[PDB]
């Protein structure tokens, strides 16, 4: 004999489904008040109960604010991952002390690192701009190596030194 | 004293005394002179048949001599935890199932009200950021220990919210153990139950997915560190434990 | 064999046999021939009256036929957690209450030594950085399960310190369950008890203040994030569970 | 009716009835007419001798009249937590011991199969970054609850991984509780057991070393903040709880 | 009949109070040693025990060091809240590499951002000085908008741009 | 009568040891399969099982990579400990804005701060170099005050003022 497919609807939402032989008594088993009702086999967990109808689960809400937050967070810790906090402080102090003296008197390595930091900021700004201008694309290919372009050899060199 | 009156009296006495002998299922030996203290050890300490039920739905066969179940303990199913995306925030572990236990519950000889134990909440690990399933409820003799609710899926830089544990409904058990509620997610540990304990999340990049320790426990929820995609441990189904005195096999 | 000696012997036998029948409260039927196997099913499986006591102070009425209480289980009250100020540090959750259980404890028929269960530790939520109250102790028959100590108030950028749970004093119980101690605060989870699970803090900006799940649990203490002022969950009072065999109603 | 047949019948009746009276150790009074409902309160409610075993190895003396043990509950030993060096990474708490309980287990009168309880895992605190010891297993009547594994030693800025809890082996118990597994270390809490609860780490610079609350619990592992060198809490040994009906003293 | 108000004194400190009828026996209920003593109804939880006197709870200790720590911590994360860490790194790199070139050759936007950073430093220093000069006032009104004055339009502009 | 010293070997590893009287039956106590075997009293927990021999625990592996990681991490958070993140930001803003103007037009306090930053970076670089050149010594004396030399009075002055 068939088996009834019951669902426990709470606040119009299905939270649990069971399959029991039809000869059972729901009141004698689940107590006086249970909230269990007969539902078609197609009904799954997490479904709307609109009147006498089991609507499927509504699609998740698309939030552009969430998209922007995720885009920024993905590119947020990336700056600290590519260049550590201690390396960031090292480069910042080095560039601050190098700028403290006249460009004429600057040692050749001082202009070399100044130029390297110039391309570094250019790369960082480009990465930030590309990440910001991605909500209209929702992080789809071109993505990844295109969202984060390969840094120049100067970037890896400055990561290596400090 | 009538000639037949004392005969009837002694017949009644012998009937009353030897009814106990097969009450515990023993022969009426005329030489033992004890019959295991009238088999009362086997009728109180012995014959304590304990039945553990784990099938999703079935009829408990109550023996003919049984009329009173004592210490019926049930635990609802547990809910799995939510998955974790490849961001930085943490998923919320699923809530543990509730439970109850009753004493001296009356049951007529014959078939029993069909016990139904709650299946463990399956992991909704088919994708990132999806909340896990919620474990089923365990119902018997008009008392239900509801299964703990499932976890919550998590997106980037926004930790989920805690989920309610199980409850108890129907005829009020004289002792009820509400299930441990699943946590908001930074701790992430899945809720415990009567027979389980709060299990914690495991930091891994392979999704080892340590499940709840024992019955009624909730999944410890997914986690994400270093691009990991741990979906979160699965819950554990609930069981029903009953005890009764009967000379028949369980 | 004297003419009166056998008469006295059979009178003694017939007065012995039936005393069990109304011993468990049954009619002395002379046709059933079983009579619940001499009321044995009734006063071994049945008649297991279970009493749950939650009143702060009262006299347990022991029925006349009762002479021995078995499985007296008690749990002390739980303590609330400390509040959290509008800073960044975390409050310390209150410690759960202790508990114990005893078997085959002897009680004279009549009135009982007054049970006193421990009231739950009220939240000291009148302000920020105040330590919550400590739950009361549960005492019966010379054995006390002390209530868990309350949480600790927290100032800015300085997390509180853990607090001790309950203990057991008086006549030594066979099994004593020391209460789960409240935590220092970063985890912040409240202590658990025999019947309770360790509850965790709930991160919210409105002060939802999830309390301890069941009896004897400790509050999970307050927390601060985004200017939140969560005071911390309240504890749960303790209960006393006793069981005994009696033909009278519980 | 033969002249000797009824005499034999009444002799058998009078030898049957009294055997219960000294069955539970009572005098055959011929005036009381009740005799504790024929020793029935003493044989069901009374005489419920409970024995707690904590010695590492010994022979349980089973009284002559005992034939069936009921509710034998055992818990394995707990594992200590790992040490923490003078760095920043946390230590992994040791896993709690498992446990089991059985009912209506049969034991021949005389001596018992020797119980062996599991000693608590000693702290390997003799040096920094050392994994703690693992608690011993608890074995009785062919059933073993294995002790929880110890913690893990931790170097600088590398938190350890979680450790397994106890298990159950031998003849399958009717109900078994796997022990709480020790955590990876950021939470750091030691695992709980049947009789204990998951204890948390204590943040201190003196190595206060809060141990597990009760039997079977696991140490909460060491920690290091501000140059602290907390080695980690010690575990708690397991115990065996047995119950049986006997007129003799336990 | 009246009801006694017992209190469990531990180390001269009240940790738990009860109200029981006077006909009870404390020894027969709490065991041999309990620590429960009769106390007046005015006695609450957490009270000093001086002699045979129930002293009220002493007032909390006022620590100036705690005041300074709270003042600084309140103003500590505020700099990272108004300006994020990534925005801070952006501003620092921009200002440093802008200073790396001569002021004459600096682009007009470079001078604009240098000035904006000037008023930003002025605002930050003023906020810090005001927070230092608050322990004598214990964070009372003037407080909040007066402890943290409104930043200029340049501050919000640089927060928005980076 | 003597007591056997049994050990439970798992995967060639001893995880638990016991001492039990020899009259016991291991099978009748631990069940059918237990893994307990007789071991000499010298055997401790955490020992190899090679052949019919209980090898002692192998010594922990010495990883030079671990040594370098510990050396760097130990000196990693030290820069944020001696100088807080907000203090680091304060110093960086100060040096950047001071360098933004000509040295001739720089205020005497600006020149003093530039010098102080000079010795500060010198001390930081010296500390980093000494920490890096310590794996061959494994952080032994000379260590600590020698690994981390005492900073000059300028360092503490800038730490206090900002």
Residue numbers in the entry:
A (entry chain c), E (entry chain b), F (entry chain a): 1 to 162
B (entry chain A), C (entry chain B), D (entry chain C): 31 to 280
The authors write:
Here, using a minimal myocyanophage, termed Pam3, isolated from Lake Chaohu, we demonstrate that the chaperone gp25 forms a stable complex with the tail fiber gp24 at a stoichiometry of 3:3. Each gp25 subunit consists of two domains: a non-conserved N-terminal β-sandwich domain that binds to the TNF-like and glycine-rich domains of the fiber, and a C-terminal α-helical domain that mediates trimerization/assembly of the fiber.
To gain structural insights into gp25-assisted assembly of gp24 trimer, we determined the cryo-EM structure of the gp24-gp25 complex at 3.1 Å resolution. The residues from Leu31 to Pro280 of gp24 were modeled to the final structure. By contrast, the structure of the full-length gp25 (residues Met1~Phe162) was solved. In the gp24-gp25 complex, the gp24 trimer adopts an extended structure, whereas three separated β-sandwich domains of gp25 trimer embrace the distal moieties of gp24 trimer at the center, forming an elongated complex structure of ~140 Å in length. Seeing along the three-fold axis, the gp25 trimer covers the distal loops of gp24, making these loops inaccessible to the solvent. These loops located at the distal of tail fiber were proposed to recognize the host; thus, the chaperone gp25 should be released prior to the maturation of viral particles. Each loop has two glycine-rich motifs (GRMs) that adopt an elongated conformation. These loops run parallel to the fiber axis and stack together into a four-layer lattice at an interval distance of ~5 Å (calculated from Cα atoms) between adjacent GRMs. By contrast, the three β-sandwich domains are separated from each other, which individually protrude outwards like three “tentacles” to stick onto the junction between C-terminal TNF-like and glycine-rich domains of gp24 trimer. The β-sandwich domain of one gp25 subunit interacts with the surface-exposed regions at the lateral of the TNF-like and glycine-rich domains of one gp24 subunit, forming an interface area of ~550 Å2.
